[PDB]
Write a protein that binds this ligand. Structure first.
Ligand SMILES: [Cl-]
Ligand SMILES: [Cl-]
Length: 97
């Protein structure tokens, strides 16, 4: 008992579905069935979404994006860039040096 270590909610087929709140679920949609792992931190280019119940790694390979709510779609760009449909756009508010 009870699931892969660190896993709270566990499926015989898809593996972990909800990690304990310490950890971050990574859901690698690997061909073809989906499999979850529980990680202490997310892999490169994943944003780590924290929530009171749970944490999750969300793919966020968006240049100059600070956060993604859902897979590769930015919900907050770095200061001075403009966010439009999940992407980040310069310019660039005194002057722009
Ligand atoms: Cl990163
Ligand atoms: Cl923004």
């Amino acid at each position: 008992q009870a699931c892969a270590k660190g896993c709270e909610l566990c499926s015989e087929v898809n593996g972990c579905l909800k990690c304990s709140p310490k950890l971050f679920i990574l859901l690698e949609r690997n061909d073809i069935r989906q499999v979850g792992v529980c990680l202490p931190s997310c892999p490169p280019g994943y944003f780590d979404a924290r929530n009171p119940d749970m944490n999750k790694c969300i793919k966020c390979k968006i240049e100059h994006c600070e956060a993604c709510f859902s897979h590769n779609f930015c919900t907050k760009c770095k200061e001075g860039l403009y966010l439009h449909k999940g992407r980040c756009y310069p310019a660039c508010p005194m002057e722009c040096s």
